Design a protein around this ligand. Sequence first.
Ligand SMILES: O=C1C[C@@H](c2ccc(C[C@H](NS(=O)(=O)c3cccc(F)c3)C3=N[C@H](CCc4ccccc4)CN3)cc2)S(=O)(=O)N1
Ligand SMILES: [Mg+2]
Length: 297
Amino acid sequence: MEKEFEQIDKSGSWAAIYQDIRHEASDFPCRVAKLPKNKNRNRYRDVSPFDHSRIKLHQEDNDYINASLIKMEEAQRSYILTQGPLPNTCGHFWEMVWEQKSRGVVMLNRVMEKGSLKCAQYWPQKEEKEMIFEDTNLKLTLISEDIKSYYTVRQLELENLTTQETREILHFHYTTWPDFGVPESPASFLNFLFKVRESGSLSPEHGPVVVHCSAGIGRSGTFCLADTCLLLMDKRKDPSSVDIKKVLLEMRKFRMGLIQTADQLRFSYLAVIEGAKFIMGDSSVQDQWKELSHEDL
Ligand SMILES: O=C1C[C@@H](c2ccc(C[C@H](NS(=O)(=O)c3cccc(F)c3)C3=N[C@H](CCc4ccccc4)CN3)cc2)S(=O)(=O)N1
Ligand SMILES: [Mg+2]
């Protein structure tokens, strides 16, 4: 895998490789997303979920949410990629989390980035100030939070007011991943990812983990591509067989525009190439990533 990487770097062909992916990517209808009544449920007019893979709310009224089920068959892992909730779809967001039985939520952006709102504050910042999303009859409470230098893990209690059932939802929030940018290093990215893995939130016993950034395609796509590829390397007889460009195209059949810049594509290679070391056995690389990520700053 690192040979193709090396030749692409030498060829200076990341932009061409990336644009070939954009040109060969699937194109499916998003008619429900474009209905007039769903306009205020979409954050960006040009980022919509395909009809065949969109997540449907269980409500009779309007089952629309800008969210997509990315189902990776060979890797055996599903992910729900959605945009950062809007002030009016925070209820919907948690209704989806509930209905799909998700156990973890991976946030890769901040609410405000370089002076622009990118996502509503959809979870409570203070223990004593819980949230109620009336339209859905769900209560959400911040139970605790473990704040690190570039990421925070939070324990939330989501409750179905109707049946009074409660569930613990884990929130994995990467706070230093610039929009249209890349993580500081493969190490800090992988250190984060393996934290989500180790939590059990990605277990096939739970519903799909919900991943989102602002549009739910660039950073969210980088995160899922890397995870899927590492899963594939550990599954196959010959890990060098994983074609990342092919995997990204498979994912793009489920949601448009996954991976938004050639450099995020390149970062994906680096993250996977670096992550292969743990998958092949190396039992010390994880401590190395942790040190390199300086999480305890
Ligand atoms: O690294 C990233 C990029 C962010 C991102 C991606 C896309 C958008 C949508 C935005 N729409 S717009 O109405 O402000 C806007 C801005 C400029 C031109 C235009 F016609 C509309 C955006 N679209 C193009 C990208 C288009 C696109 C490509 C492929 C699939 C879907 C959309 C670039 N930024 C916002 C943020 S992420 O939160 O997904 N992670
Ligand atoms: Mg306090």
